[PDB]
RNA sequence: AGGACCGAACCGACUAAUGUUGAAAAAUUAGCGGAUGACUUGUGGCUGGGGGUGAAAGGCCAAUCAAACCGGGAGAUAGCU
RNA sequence: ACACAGGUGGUCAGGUAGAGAAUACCAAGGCGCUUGAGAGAACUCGGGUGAAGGAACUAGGCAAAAUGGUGCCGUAACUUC
RNA sequence: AAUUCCUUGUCGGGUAAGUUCCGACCUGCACGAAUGGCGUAAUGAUGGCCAGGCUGUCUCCACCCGAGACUCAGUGAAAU
RNA sequence: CGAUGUCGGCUCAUCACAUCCUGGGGCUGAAGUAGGUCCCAAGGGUAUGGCUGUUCGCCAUUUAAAGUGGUACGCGAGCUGGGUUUAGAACGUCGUGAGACAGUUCGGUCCCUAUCUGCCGUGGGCGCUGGAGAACUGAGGGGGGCUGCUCCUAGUACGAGAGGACCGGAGUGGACGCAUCACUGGUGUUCGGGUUGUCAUGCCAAUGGCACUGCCCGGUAGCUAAAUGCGGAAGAGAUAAGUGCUGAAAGCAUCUAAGCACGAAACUUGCCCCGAGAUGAGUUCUCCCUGACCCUUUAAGGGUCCUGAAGGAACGUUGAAGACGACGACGUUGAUAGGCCGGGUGUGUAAGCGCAGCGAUGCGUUGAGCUAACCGGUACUAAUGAACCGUGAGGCUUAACCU
């Protein structure tokens, strides 16, 4: 698959920041509303990262004014404009799906700081 | 028009500029090179026989090698044949490239599908399973009844029963061609085409309107 | 329907296969040539040859890592003391299978699997 | 992916608190409701002096699902809990005046424009 | 579930038309020992492709 | 204390699945009821065929029970096959 | 009837965890069940997991899933207390 | 009503919708007082109905682990 | 009656048309919208639930519609066993009673390893007239045909207004089918980790066995669906009902008698698949074989020697092919499988050692170690030289050419 490997890496964006699950992340996303092309922000804990080159996703979980939301993002989509890491987070797993069962003080991730 | 013989390289996606992922299948279409031209005056129908790829010298037999040697062409991995469309003209030894699809806008892709072996009627024919409990005695995935009673006292032809699913010619129609890349010899069509990776495809222009 | 799956099942469950290859790898390291069935030989390659390559690099973590697999201490003495420095330049291909007929008891296709030196 | 017999939460303040889906409208043998699809519901629980009382049968539109919606780039948006807004039965455009929680960009249509005029996110 | 007329010996042999065993079909001769063996197998003396192996 | 409670041995047999030319002429597996009592069990004894015994089902009386098994009357009789 | 997955009374009863003769892993001791080798189709049997939904199944929640310990708090109608 | 034919009686409760269920009425075809009447706490591998939880029961099946099934070697039935 | 299992449910159908929807059309007490009624039409489509054993029915909410029948009231060697209709028991009633009631109620064993036909798949033999390798045409056969809603045309036509089109076009759904794994997920007892009890490796540390994979948490490839692509068409021909044009018999009239034109999801094609056993066994291209000598009851006769081609088969390494055969790839002038190397992925920062802490533990080396089926390479191992099968120019007659 040098054809496919050569063909996908022509599309991979270069400046994707290094983040790992547990991190609070603001993701800025192009949202189109008719003619105006707005850019809105989705901040939450990374609970899952799939690395597959171009087909790399990451799931961000927010508790939005009420109930909880999980956006899975394709990392190399042109929709996903910015990824910035707000708070670096210290966890032990690789997929943090237990946090789907926890709210508030139980869903509280220590900071990494190294 | 005619088609070209490809090879299923696999699947990827193509992010558009406005952020719409398109699932594409990559089909490497090398130089299909014409080995025989068929006319009404000798065969009753106008068609070209092309070959593609390359074969080992010791693995091609003497009949086959004599055929490609007459054509004045390198031996490929197979011979295929395309029916011609009344105003088209090809010569023997002429090479045909993916550039032919630089106008076509939508194609039909024909391959052999993935062989699923002896399949039961729930996989094969989408029969619905009977109860998984409530008394049922050894008949969960079985086909049920297969016909009527004394009248007819036979099972009709083409009753859907279990047997070999997969591994047969299927044509997927009206796939949007996303890119034609004459440099790398590639054709990116939108969607899934039949076959496992590396399987030989046949990409023609779409006959539907 | 199996497509691209690797690994014979050998009419055993997973723990009996694991145990069986642990013993049979121990026997091939011990005696340097054993007679088994042809499928059990062909799976014994994929168990045995990784122990030789682990043995090509002697450290406490590889001795313990080759004692988790194989579970015998004489075996991880011969690996790391004899076989690992024996091959040492041989890149794969530590063992050959030689088909040798059929059993009498059940007509099974036997095969002698052996290490690839045995210059003694 | 809301089907019959499914208990949905209520996103507006119409008075209902917990509803059950009784049909998925819009086709024959249609199985699932979804992103912004209309269902028929019955009200299984209400607050004591809301506009809708217990055991009423009316329409609703699904605004959030646990299964989620897929965007055209491949990105999904799953919620935690299925939710609907109770539309009026005859001529739609819903009962309640507030809308709680977020909604999605796939109620961006004519009718549900009302629902996304409210609705603090998305 | 059981037959309804006894099948003949004709139909019986017709069914057994395929039960025939195929011969070996020719077994190969060793390079050094010059003795015969199945192909791709070792000989009775324990040679294979002209070199000595097992030796029990 | 208890025809007490939970629960093994022990006695049983409510459900399901398998089995149904069975591994088995009534079982196996997973759950199930009783489990100091009107309990359960070993060894011996007693009751016998229109008779026994029966917390009663026409149940049980040696894989047999609206009248055991064996032998005899007996080659019953059979306007029926 | 079988070298039969059944039946058969008493006696001895170690370790660790455990209330325990339950249960798990072990000791003494005894076994691997008298056809094997492959392959890894449908289908059947015994099991594991399952998106969203959660009895819509169905004669019927049959089956499965769930619950499950010890201590403490707390506990309604009704009652023969 | 373990009793009611007509009958899914009529009204009410539960349900989006209830021939079943609960309450009531009484025109009891064909209840009824030790072949007991009516109540009845506790009990029941008892019958019927409802709800919470729970789930592959199901929507609609998918994959996996094992034992057969399939191939090879040995033995080698049966009903008909 | 030396047994033809009988309701209902499930699974699986299949035909008829007296058509429920979709399609065409005539009359209308048809303005439009919506209808009523009748002719044509069988392509495809033609609910989910409450109650009840129920078919039915009533109800709730859908739908374009929820057709009517035949098929042993289709289907129990396909499933169930709720009902009817065994043996237990009770109620009401009948009988003095044993009992009895298609009155009611509770409980209650559904066997079969397929020989033949049929059907679904899949091979072996032989034929097709020398052998062999491929590519084909296509007789014929099968699959597929469903449809909503929104928008424009146009708030036009019609109508007093309310309301509201025909014909034509664009979009987007439902149900169904095919493919596929890029995405989202499921699984992933073969990968990594956490952790309980216990046993062992002498012991600490580290590991391993067993407890449903011990219980769990993630997860590669593959398979998959709830995932994502695509499909049902346009068009042509011959028509049904129907509408006509010209036109007599019948100096008018008249769609028909001569002649001519329209006309539907039905019909034949168009689309997809199988397909030369299509014994009517076809076509095209290519490849190979260019020896002698006897015998006779002189035949497309038999035999001996020498030759053994093209190719196939066997064997081996095997495969996104597979029950087995089959099919595909490769066999050393070689990446076919395994190993190995690099990468990726997954898990989540190994062991050892050092430091902090009384200790559990924490931190550093360290995103470390380990990584299955993945990807790119590499002859290290195994794919052996050979043998085997297959021959030696391919009948007769007639015709046209031998330029």
UniProtKB/Swiss-Prot annotation, chain A:
The entry lists its GO molecular-function terms as: large ribosomal subunit rRNA binding; structural constituent of ribosome
- Provide one Gene Ontology cellular component: cytoplasm
Pfam families on file: Ribosomal_L19
Q: Per the UniProt entry, what are the Gene Ontology biological process annotations, in alphabetical order?
A: cytoplasmic translation; ribosomal large subunit assembly
- Which PROSITE patterns does the protein's record reference? RIBOSOMAL_L19 (PS01015)
* Induction entry: Part of the rpsP-rimM-trmD-rplS operon.
Q: Does the keyword Ribosomal protein apply?
A: yes
Q: Which InterPro entries match?
A: Ribosomal_bL19, Ribosomal_bL19_CS, Ribosomal_bL19_sf, Translation_prot_SH3-like_sf
Q: Which domain of life is it from?
A: Bacteria
Q: Which UniProt keywords apply?
A: Ribonucleoprotein, Ribosomal protein, RNA-binding, rRNA-binding
Q: How does it assemble?
A: Part of the 50S ribosomal subunit. Contacts L14. Forms two bridges to the 30S subunit in the 70S ribosome, contacting the 16S rRNA. In pre-50S ribosomal subunits interacts with RsfS, which may inhibit association with the 30S subunit.
The UniProt similarity line reads: Belongs to the bacterial ribosomal protein bL19 family.
User: Per its database record, what is this protein's job?
Assistant: This protein is located at the 30S-50S ribosomal subunit interface and may play a role in the structure and function of the aminoacyl-tRNA binding site.
- The protein depicted here goes by the name Large ribosomal subunit protein bL19
Name the source organism: Escherichia coli (strain K12)
Swiss-Prot record, chain B:
| N5-methylglutamine PTM sites in chain numbering | 150
UniProt keyword annotation of Ion transport present: no
Output the GO biological process annotations, alphabetical, semicolon-separated.
cytoplasmic translation; ribosomal large subunit assembly
GO CC, alphabetical: cytoplasm; cytosol; cytosolic large ribosomal subunit
Recorded hits in InterPro entries, A to Z, give:
Ribosomal_uL3, Ribosomal_uL3_bac/org-type, Ribosomal_uL3_CS, Transl_B-barrel_sf
Q: Name one GO molecular function term.
A: rRNA binding
N6-succinyllysine modification sites are 38
Per its UniProt record, what Pfam families does this chain match? Ribosomal_L3 (PF00297)
Is Ribosomal protein among the key words of this record? yes
Modification(s) after translation: Methylated by PrmB.
The UniProt keyword set, sorted, is:
Methylation, Ribonucleoprotein, Ribosomal protein, RNA-binding, rRNA-binding
What family is it from? Belongs to the universal ribosomal protein uL3 family.
Q: How does it assemble?
A: Part of the 50S ribosomal subunit. Forms a cluster with proteins L14 and L19. In pull-down experiments interacts with CedA.
Identify the HAMAP family for this entry: Ribosomal_uL3_B
The record's function comment reads: One of two assembly initiator proteins, it binds directly near the 3'-end of the 23S rRNA, where it nucleates assembly of the 50S subunit.
Name of this protein: Large ribosomal subunit protein uL3
Q: Which gene encodes it?
A: rplC
Curated annotation (Swiss-Prot), chain D:
Task: Give the residue range of the signal peptide.
Answer: none
Entry's Gene Ontology BP terms:
cytoplasmic translation
Known outcome of mutating residue 114 to A: Reduced RsfS binding
The record, for InterPro entries, names: Ribosomal_uL14, Ribosomal_uL14_bac-type, Ribosomal_uL14_CS, Ribosomal_uL14_sf
* One Gene Ontology MF term: structural constituent of ribosome
A single Gene Ontology CC annotation of this entry is: cytosolic large ribosomal subunit
SMART domains xref list: Ribosomal_L14
Alphabetically sorted, this entry's keywords are:
Ribonucleoprotein, Ribosomal protein, RNA-binding, rRNA-binding
Any Pfam family matching the protein: Ribosomal_L14
SUPFAM superfamilies associated with the record: Ribosomal protein L14 (SSF50193)
Complex formation = Part of the 50S ribosomal subunit. Forms a cluster with proteins L3 and L19. Forms two bridges to the 30S subunit in the 70S ribosome, contacting the 16S rRNA. In pre-50S ribosomal subunits interacts with RsfS, which may inhibit association with the 30S subunit.
Q: Which PANTHER family match?
A: 50S/60S RIBOSOMAL PROTEIN L14/L23, LARGE RIBOSOMAL SUBUNIT PROTEIN UL14M
Q: Which family is annotated?
A: Belongs to the universal ribosomal protein uL14 family.
According to its UniProt entry, the function of this protein is described as: Binds to 23S rRNA. Forms part of two intersubunit bridges in the 70S ribosome. In the 3.5 A resolved structures L14 and L19 interact and together make contact with the 16S rRNA in bridges B5 and B8.
NCBIfam families in the record: rplN_bact (TIGR01067)
* Protein name, entry field: Large ribosomal subunit protein uL14
Curated annotation (Swiss-Prot), chain E:
- Matching SUPFAM superfamilies: Zn-binding ribosomal proteins
Q: Which Pfam family is one of this chain's hits?
A: Ribosomal_L32p
Q: Which GO terms describe its biological process?
A: cytoplasmic translation; response to radiation; response to reactive oxygen species; ribosomal large subunit assembly
- What keywords does the record list, in alphabetical order? Ribonucleoprotein, Ribosomal protein
Q: Which InterPro entries match?
A: Ribosomal_bL32 (IPR002677), Ribosomal_bL32_bact (IPR044957), Ribosomal_zn-bd (IPR011332)
Q: Extract the ranges annotated as region (Disordered).
A: 1-37
Q: What GO cellular component entries does it have?
A: cytoplasm; cytosol; cytosolic large ribosomal subunit
Q: Which GO terms describe its molecular function?
A: structural constituent of ribosome
| Quaternary structure note | Part of the 50S ribosomal subunit. Contacts L17.
Instruction: Output the PANTHER family linked to this UniProt entry.
Output: 50S RIBOSOMAL PROTEIN L32, LARGE RIBOSOMAL SUBUNIT PROTEIN BL32
State the family named in the UniProt similarity comment for this chain. Belongs to the bacterial ribosomal protein bL32 family.
List the HAMAP family hit by this protein, alphabetically.
Answer: Ribosomal_bL32 (MF_00340)
Which protein, by its recorded name, is this? Large ribosomal subunit protein bL32
């Amino acid at each position: 698959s040098n054809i496919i490997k050569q063909l996908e890496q022509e599309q991979m964006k270069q400046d994707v920041p290094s983040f790992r699950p547990g991190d609070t992340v603001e993701v800025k996303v192009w949202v189109v509303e008719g003619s105006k092309k707005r850019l809105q922000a989705f901040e939450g804990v990374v609970i899952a990262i799939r690395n597959r080159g171009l087909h790399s996703a990451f799931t961000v979980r927010k508790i939005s004014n009420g109930e909880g939301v999980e956006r899975v993002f394709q990392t190399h989509s042109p929709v996903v404009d910015s990824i910035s890491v707000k708070r670096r987070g210290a966890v032990r797993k690789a997929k943090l799906y237990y946090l789907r069962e926890r709210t508030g003080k139980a869903a509280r991730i220590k900071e990494r700081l190294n | 028009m005619i088609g070209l013989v490809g090879k299923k390289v696999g699947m990827t996606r193509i992010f558009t500029e406005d952020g719409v992922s398109i699932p594409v299948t990559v089909i490497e279409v090398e130089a299909n090179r014409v080995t025989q031209v068929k006319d009404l005056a000798n065969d009753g129908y106008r068609a070209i026989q092309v070959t593609t790829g390359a074969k080992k010298a010791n693995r091609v037999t003497k009949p086959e090698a004599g055929h490609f040697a007459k054509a004045g062409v390198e031996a490929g991995r197979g011979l295929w044949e395309f029916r011609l469309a009344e105003g088209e003209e090809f010569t023997v030894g002429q090479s045909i490239s993916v550039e032919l699809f630089a106008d076509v806008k939508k194609v039909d892709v024909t391959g052999t599908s993935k062989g699923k072996g002896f399949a039961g009627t729930v996989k094969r024919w989408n029969f619905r399973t009977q109860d998984a409990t409530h008394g049922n005695s050894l008949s969960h995935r079985v086909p049920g009844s297969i016909g009527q009673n004394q009248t007819p006292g036979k099972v009709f032809k083409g009753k859907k029963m279990a047997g070999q699913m997969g591994n047969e010619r299927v044509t997927v129609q009206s796939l949007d061609v996303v890119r034609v890349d004459a440099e790398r010899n590639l054709l990116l069509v939108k969607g899934a085409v039949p076959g496992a990776t590396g399987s030989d495809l046949i990409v023609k222009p779409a006959v539907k309107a | 329907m199996r497509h691209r799956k690797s690994g014979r099942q050998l009419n055993r469950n997973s723990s009996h296969r694991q145990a069986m290859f642990r013993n049979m790898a121990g026997s091939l390291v011990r005696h340097e040539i054993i007679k088994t069935t042809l499928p059990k030989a062909k799976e014994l390659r994929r168990v045995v040859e990784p122990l030789i390559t682990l043995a090509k690099t002697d450290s406490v973590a590889n001795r313990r890592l080759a004692f988790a697999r194989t579970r015998d201490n004489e075996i991880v003495a011969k690996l790391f003391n004899e076989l690992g420095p024996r091959f040492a330049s041989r890149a794969g291909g530590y063992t050959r299978i030689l088909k040798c007929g059929f059993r009498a008891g059940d007509n099974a296709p036997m095969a002698y699997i052996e290490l690839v030196d045995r210059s003694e | 992916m809301i089907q019959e017999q499914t208990m949905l939460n209520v996103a507006d303040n119409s008075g209902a608190r917990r509803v059950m889906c009784i049909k998925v409208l819009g086709g024959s043998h249609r199985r699932y409701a979804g992103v912004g699809d209309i269902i028929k519901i019955t009200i299984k629980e209400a607050i004591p002096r809301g506009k809708v009382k217990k055991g009423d049968v009316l329409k609703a539109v699904v605004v959030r699902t646990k299964k989620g919606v897929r965007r055209p780039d491949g990105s999904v948006i799953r919620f935690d809990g299925n939710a609907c807004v109770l539309l009026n039965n005859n001529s739609e455009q819903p009962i309640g005046t507030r809308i709680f929680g977020p909604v999605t960009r796939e109620l961006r249509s004519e009718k549900f424009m009302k629902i996304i005029s409210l609705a603090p996110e998305v | 579930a059981v037959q309804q007329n006894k099948p003949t010996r004709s139909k019986r042999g017709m069914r057994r038309s395929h039960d025939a065993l195929t011969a070996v079909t020719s077994l190969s001769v060793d390079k050094t020992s010059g003795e015969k063996h199945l192909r791709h197998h070792i000989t009775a003396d324990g040679y294979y492709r002209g070199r000595k192996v097992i030796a029990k």
